[PDB]
């Protein structure tokens, strides 16, 4: 009949997502273990926590 009817709604779909994490300054000391020079004894393998 004559009148105004509401059917559905519309939303502006979002664009490409954005991920923003803080500056990476701290790092593991992996350079001094994998690129090391001399190792410990076999029966005293180290546990570098």
């Amino acid at each position, epitope marked *: 009949e004559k009148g105004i009817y509401q059917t559905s709604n519309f939303r502006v779909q979002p664009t490409e997502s954005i991920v923003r994490f803080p500056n990476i300054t701290n790092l593991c000391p992996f350079g001094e273990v994998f690129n090391a020079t*001399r*190792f*410990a*004894s076999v029966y*005293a393998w*180290n546990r570098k926590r």
Partner: nanobody
Amino acid sequence: VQLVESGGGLVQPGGSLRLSCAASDFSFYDYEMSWVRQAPGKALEWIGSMYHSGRTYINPSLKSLVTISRDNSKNTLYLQMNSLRAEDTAMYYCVSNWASGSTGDYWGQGTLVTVS
């Protein structure tokens, strides 16, 4: 000082030299003593290894050439080298716990072994 070394200077081939390696206490003697060399270009070569359990295991071609004596008053080690060669010509170190890496060890003042 917790760990130190003594003796050295110039070593006469064939003769006997009473080298020393003093310290402050026996409680710091875990787990090894060693008198080693780091020659330029040569790989790791260890000439001595005095162990915490009163053991000295050396290369079979060297332990006959080396005399062993351990003290506890000054906690010094007595070791004698004869028929010296130029392959030992380096900053001869007394490294306590040589196999424990370069953090649980002390590097001594050093000396030289030269053949005229």
